[PDB]
A paper describes a structure:
Epitope I (residues 412 to 423) is a prime example of such a structural flexibility, as epitope peptides comprising this segment have been crystallized in complex with nAb fragments in three distinct conformations. This suggests that the conformation of this amino acid segment follows an “induced-fit” binding mode to the antibody, and this conformational flexibility could explain the limited immunogenicity to the epitope I observed in patients with HCV. Binding kinetics of E2_EpiI scaffolds E2_S2_1 and E2_S3_3 against Fabs AP33 and HCV1 using sE2 as control are shown. Superposition of AP33 and HCV1 Fab complexes onto the designed E2_S3_3T1 structure revealed steric hindrance of Fab AP33 but not Fab HCV1 with juxtaposed loops. The steric clashes are caused by a variation in the angle of approach of the two Fabs to the epitope, which differs by 22° between HCV1 and AP33 (51). Together with the low thermostability profile of E2_S3 variants, a scaffold size that might hinder the assembly of multivalent NPs for immunization and the apparent limited antibody binding of E2_S3 variants, these results identified E1_S1 and E2_S2_1 as the most promising immunogen candidates.
Residue numbers in the entry: 8 to 24, 28 to 59, 64 to 288
Write the structure that this text describes.
Amino acid sequence: KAEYYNAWSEWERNAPGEQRGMAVSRLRDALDRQSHELELNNLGLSSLPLPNVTKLFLNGNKLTDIKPLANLKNLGWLFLDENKVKDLSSLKDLKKLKSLSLEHNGISDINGLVHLPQLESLYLGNNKITDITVLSRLTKLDTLSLEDNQISDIVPLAGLTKLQNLYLSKNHISDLRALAGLKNLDVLELFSQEILNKPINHQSNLVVPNTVKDTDGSLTTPAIISDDGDYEKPNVKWHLPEFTNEVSFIFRQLVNIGGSWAIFSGRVTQPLKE
């Protein structure tokens, strides 16, 4: 009991020249009243110093180390938006966790999340994620937000049949074939994809195969083509008598998956050399 207040005061005294005093006050109130909710939102905390706490609010801080949360096995809801958390293996034993929010954290390695197969909602919007392989194990998710990342391979999502809300806008998605089986979807977002092809040699008669495919595998007909190019399936064609550094084309197609209807929109950019 006394060791808890001692550790909290020692943590507060180590604040750099951050509202650690308010954090200590809230910790004392939660420990005294045996509260199940701990709200430490927007305290600028750069570090961290309760068996009944089930919801932990930590949005709006500067946390990089989440080791002090490793033994909070009663946690059901954990919010860590706008932090700087990069390692997630510290949550491997939070087997009661149902909801997890890690938006605006700049995270690229989400492999540790393979240790939370019971998760029901997962928010990873606005990060640096490319590989979502381990997400294939989270077969109990009904909400998954992956918007504003660098994801190009969404095949790991093909078996997550329980999904009802899926946010995939602002990524590098060009192939929706992996989503064809998610017939339980209610909300789906797929707009503003940015696809970058490998650089190819410039030609006066430039021919670029279209690679944008819908959920049926059919090529998406481009909506706009730069440099007066045209489309004759499967090829986008340009006449470039003078060299230019890049061409591009923008696509926009309505897609229906389950009970969800979404605009699959984006832009493919083709760099040219020589």
